[PDB]
Paper text:
We determined the crystal structure of AmxMT1 by single-wavelength anomalous dispersion (SAD) phasing at 1.60-Å resolution, and one molecule was found in the asymmetric unit. AmxMT1 has an NAD(P)-binding Rossmann fold similar to the αβα sandwich core domain, which consists of seven β-strands and five α-helices and is commonly found in class I SAM-MTs. An α-helix (α9) was inserted between β-strand 7 and α-helix 10 of the core domain. The core domain and α9 are covered by an additional α-domain at the N-terminus, and S-adenosyl-l-homocysteine (SAH) is located in the pocket between the core domain and inserted helix, although we added SAM to the enzyme for crystallization. The ribosyl moiety of the bound SAH forms hydrogen bonds with D202, a water molecule, and the main-chain NH of G182. The terminal carboxyl group of SAH forms a salt bridge with R159 and a hydrogen-bond network that includes a water molecule and several main-chain atoms (carbonyl groups of Y181 and A249; and NH of G184 and F185). The adenine ring is surrounded by aromatic side chains F138, F203, F232, Y254, and W229, and its edge is exposed to the molecular surface. In the crystal structure of AmxMT1, a similar long pocket and SAH were found between the core domain and inserted helix α9. A His-Glu dyad (H304-E308) and Y254 were also found on the surface of the pocket. The substrate binding pocket of AmxMT1 is shorter than that of CurJ C-MT and narrower than that of citrinin synthase CMeT, implying that the substrate of AmxMT1 has a short chain connected to AmxACP3 through the phosphopantetheine group.
Here, we report the crystal structure of a SAM-dependent methyltransferase from anammox bacteria (AmxMT1) that has a substrate and active site pocket between a class I SAM methyltransferase-like core domain and an additional α-helix inserted into the core domain. Two SAM-MTs (AmxMT1, 2) are found in many species and genera of anammox bacteria. AmxMT1 is categorized as a class I SAM-MT, which has a Rossmann fold and is the largest family of SAM-MTs, and the enzyme is unusual because it is phylogenetically distant from homologous SAM-MTs in this family. Structural comparisons with homologous SAM-dependent C-methyltransferases in polyketide synthase, AmxACP pull-down assays, AmxACP/AmxMT1 complex structure predictions by AlphaFold, and a substrate docking simulation suggested that a small compound connected to AmxACP could be inserted into the pocket of AmxMT1, and then the enzyme transfers a methyl group from SAM to the substrate to produce branched lipids.
Residue numbers in the entry: 17 to 95, 115 to 349
């Protein structure tokens, strides 16, 4: 299991030994001790975040209790995977080595194997039915940040839609074309027309019946996330729909992410994919719902522990 693997990492790197010897710590004190005692170079946001995720996971797994903002180590009384490869590298990354993977040509096979997994296929299929079930055929849909094209493939498997495909790099386009059911029917937009998150989408206002946005939310920088979703709102027709597949950072309130296995799994996913170039991490679900509402979306559906979102433009 992935959680057991990350716990084994925590123990083998001496993180658990350090924290139990400290006995009590705030997140700030723990991060200072990771720097001073383990020698981690927490020199950027993504590495500082990984260290925070480790503490959050130890708390979720009941190694720690919390009073106010202070954690306490709980003393016990007497008597092959993409994720595996990420965790195998995490010690090197935390010591300041470059990201393990990126969205460049050399890494395309890695992403193809990872994003083809059954859990992603399930989440995409649910969202596709949420967006298109019961609709008139041949909706105009933007497949945004489509990568290897599993999203386009599943959309064409399930429904007759007119896909416009856009990514911020063109490194996957040939692989996606050789995967989907109807490559001639797709409007492939050249990646030179869109620098990516933070730049306006190269489409006019109110053009699309739907925007499909799967597994790309955690690559949006915090500084740009409001704009990215406002700009998507701009290109949707009134009555159009934005579908998101992501994960939600486990919420203390347990309002959105309830399944204990999923709460642990999301933390381990976030820690692991932090070794990939550009990872920003999963966002808090209450803040996401608040953001979508202020932009002007109606929150039609939140499902799968707040991993699948249907957002309608009124
Ligand atoms: N800074 C950035 N701006 C726009 N897209 C970005 C980006 N960083 C990553 N991405 C894109 O986000 C995607 C992450 S992988 C998800 C691919 C596909 N949607 C699927 O469901 O499997 C990739 O297409 C990647 O090119």
């Amino acid at each position: 299991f992935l959680t057991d693997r990350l716990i084994r990492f925590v123990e083998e790197e001496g993180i658990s030994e350090l924290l139990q010897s400290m006995r009590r710590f705030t997140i700030e004190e723990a991060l200072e001790a990771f720097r001073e005692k383990l020698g981690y170079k927490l020199q950027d946001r993504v590495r500082l975040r990984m260290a925070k995720v480790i503490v959050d996971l130890l708390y979720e797994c009941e190694y720690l209790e919390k009073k106010g903002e202070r954690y306490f180590w709980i003393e016990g009384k007497g008597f092959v995977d993409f994720f595996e490869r990420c965790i195998m590298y995490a010690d090197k990354f935390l010591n300041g080595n470059p990201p393990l993977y990126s969205f460049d040509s050399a890494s395309t096979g890695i992403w193809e194997e990872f994003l083809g997994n059954t859990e992603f296929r399930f989440a995409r299929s649910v969202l596709i039915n949420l967006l298109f079930s019961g609709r008139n055929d041949n909706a105009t849909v933007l497949a945004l940040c489509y990568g290897p094209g599993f999203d386009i493939l599943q959309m064409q498997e399930q429904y007759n839609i007119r896909v416009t495909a856009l990514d911020f790099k063109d490194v996957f386009q040939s692989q996606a074309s050789r995967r989907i059911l109807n490559p001639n029917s797709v409007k492939w937009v050249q990646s030179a027309l869109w620098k990516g998150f933070g730049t306006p989408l190269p489409f006019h206002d109110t053009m699309f019946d739907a925007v499909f946005f799967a597994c790309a939310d955690p690559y949006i920088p915090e500084e740009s996330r409001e704009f990215v979703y406002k700009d998507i709102f701009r290109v949707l027709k009134h009555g159009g729909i934005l579908g998101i597949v992501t994960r939600s950072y486990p919420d203390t309130e347990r309002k959105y992410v309830k399944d204990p296995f999923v709460r642990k799994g999301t933390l381990c996913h976030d820690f692991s994919e932090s070794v990939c170039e550009g990872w920003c991490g999963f966002y808090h679900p209450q803040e996401s719902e608040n953001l979508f509402k202020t932009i002007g979306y109606h929150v039609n559906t939140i499902m799968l522990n707040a991993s699948v979102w249907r957002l309608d433009k009124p």
